[PDB]
Every structure is written in C-alpha cells, then in structure tokens.
Design a protein around this ligand. Structure first.
Ligand SMILES: [Cu+2]
Ligand SMILES: [Cu+2]
Length: 107
C-alpha cells in the first residue's frame, strides 16, 4: 500500500482528472473477492512501473459517484487514464502476467 493512491469522490477530479501521465484506477469493494486477490498484484505493479505509472484505488461503496461517470457495470474494473482521459479498460480478474500485458500494450 505504500505506492497506492487512495482516491475518493471528493479527490478524483483533482488527483486523476488534473494529472498528466498514466494512472491505473482500480474500482473495487470489500465484498469482491477477485478485487482483493488483485490487491497484492497492484502493489507489485505500482513498484515495477513506478515512474511510468501511478496506481490508485477507488472503493465504490464508500465513493459511489465516480464509477457511473464512466459507465462501469461491475467490479473489478481497471481504467487506465492518460492525462485525464480513459485510454484503456480491463474488466474482470487479472493475473500479474495479464496485467503486465495490458499495461505494456498501453504504455
Ligand atoms: Cu505498499
Ligand atoms: Cu522496484
């Protein structure tokens, strides 16, 4: 968790929308087992990709306003923002290797 940005509905418009560079946003909730499984993978990705990527998390139960802005249907959903715009999307479970493939194709 040392490299994960904790987002809220109150901070999203600053920390994501006013940021240049790439930010991987994980939309999650505590009831979601696959979300909890990807959590340690995100710590590893945040470290390996530091300096070309920031990793952030938004809990959709605590912060219900953001996900509908992007039409999110279910979780996990990962949105890769580049300079305030969604540039890539991945839904559902992902292994480390699958997440690295997704990031490498988009960074
Ligand atoms: Cu950490
Ligand atoms: Cu490292």
């Amino acid at each position: 968790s040392d490299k994960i940005i904790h987002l809220t509905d109150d901070s999203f418009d600053t920390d994501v929308l006013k940021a240049d560079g790439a930010i991987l946003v994980d939309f999650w909730a505590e009831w979601c087992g696959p979300c909890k499984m990807i959590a340690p993978i995100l710590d590893e990705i945040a470290d390996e990709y530091q300096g070309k990527l920031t990793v952030a998390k938004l809990n959709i139960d605590q912060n219900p306003g953001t996900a509908p802005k992007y039409g999110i249907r279910g979780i996990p959903t990962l949105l890769l923002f580049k300079n305030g715009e969604v540039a890539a999307t991945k839904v559902g479970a992902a292994s480390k290797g699958q997440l690295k493939e997704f990031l490498d194709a988009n960074l």
